[PDB]
């Protein structure tokens, strides 16, 4: 089984290298594409067939605010199961996840009852993104706001442009559940503005003339700063990308 | 691809799929001739059942589940060097 993992990680790295080379060749060929006149690999393997399942877990010894936030994230996703982590080491945690059969994992870190980091890891030794989430506002924070509608939701993605934007979009999209209804009620919005993708739930009704939206769910601003190829146990997997803080042009460059 | 099928299916690919070569890259035996000698002496097994004839192309999954037969001098000595022998399993 460990040999299974070794062989499978090596082939996965090989596939990713080949995909990168083919992407560069496609970019070259695009010049000819305008002269005469697609999803990623894991998600192509299991795109519309199998509905993803997520485990959303706390960092370690979570304060009640962190537990509240974890439950809120679960209520946000469909096909989610919440996990309280006590004395799980990361290796056996992810091993239990793979063995149990789990599309993916979301582990949340907070700073004294204020969440600040969020890690999304895809288990068939897929990618792990590390976001920093800042401007959180919880429903427990607000009020008794009724109950989450829990229907399969529509999705909004806005201003994702470069290949990095495409990567993050596919990750979030395949976290979510596939194939909603036409009149599916609630919709999850992922706006981008200067790298700070911000998310909100909205319920709505197409009014007698147009639409009106009641904003619900959490409210936070979350920004990528790492995207590792391997899985989150490894910490020595090659980095697909890496946010640079101390570069000359730090305060201007977007998507870097 | 299909041009892959027309070009890179080679006697080299088949022969590197051959079992003793699998033993060598997976590192059972340091040399091809030592690997074949071990197959003759009957020390390897693929899944449940063991293998005696080297000209045995190992399927993907099976070659992933290759290892030694139990209670062989070879495994006993390996574990002895590791100081991880465990006579309950009569390793």
């Amino acid at each position: 089984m460990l040999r299974r993992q070794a062989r499978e990680r090596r082939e996965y790295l090989y596939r990713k290298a080949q995909e990168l080379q083919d992407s560069q060749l496609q970019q070259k060929r695009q010049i000819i594409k305008q002269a005469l006149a697609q999803v990623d690999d894991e998600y192509a393997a299991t795109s519309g067939i199998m509905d993803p399942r997520i485990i959303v877990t706390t960092s370690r010894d979570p304060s009640t605010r962190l537990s509240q936030f974890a439950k809120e994230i679960k209520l946000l996703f469909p096909n989610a199961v919440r996990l309280n982590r006590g004395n799980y080491v990361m290796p056996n945690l992810v091993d239990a996840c793979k063995k149990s059969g789990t599309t993916d994992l979301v582990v949340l870190h907070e700073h004294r009852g204020v969440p600040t980091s969020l890690t999304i890891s895809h288990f068939p030794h897929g990618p792990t993104a590390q976001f920093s989430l800042h401007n959180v506002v919880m429903r427990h924070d607000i009020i008794n706001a009724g109950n989450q509608s829990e229907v399969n939701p529509h999705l909004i993605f806005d201003n994702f442009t470069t290949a990095l934007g495409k990567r993050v979009v596919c990750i979030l999209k395949h976290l979510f559940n596939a194939g909603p209804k036409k009149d599916s009620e609630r919709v999850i919005t992922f706006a981008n503005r200067g790298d700070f993708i911000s998310v909100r739930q909205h319920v709505y009704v197409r009014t007698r003339e147009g639409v009106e939206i009641a904003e619900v769910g959490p409210r936070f601003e979350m920004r990528l700063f790492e995207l590792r190829l391997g899985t989150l146990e490894n910490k020595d997997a090659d980095v697909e990308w890496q946010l640079r803080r101390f570069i000359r042009t730090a305060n201007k460059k977007d998507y870097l | 691809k299909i041009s892959d099928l027309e070009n890179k299916v080679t006697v080299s690919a088949i022969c590197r799929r051959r079992l003793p070569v699998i033993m060598h890259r997976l590192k059972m035996a340091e040399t091809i001739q030592d690997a074949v000698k071990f197959i003759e002496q009957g020390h390897v097994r693929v899944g449940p059942n063991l293998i005696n004839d080297p000209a045995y192309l190992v399927t993907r999954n099976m070659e992933d589940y290759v290892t030694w037969v139990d209670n062989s001098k070879i495994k006993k000595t390996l574990l002895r060097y590791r100081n991880q022998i465990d006579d309950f399993d009569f390793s």
Binding site: - | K27, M28, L78
Partner: peptide
């Protein structure tokens, strides 16, 4: 080195698996 350890393949077989102060120095 860490990558090699993570892929040790715990079944490898090399063959070599089968093996006063001045006064004490002088004696030894």
């Amino acid at each position: 080195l860490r990558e090699k350890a993570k892929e040790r393949n715990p079944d490898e077989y090399y063959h070599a698996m089968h093996s006063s102060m001045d006064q004490v120095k002088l004696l030894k």
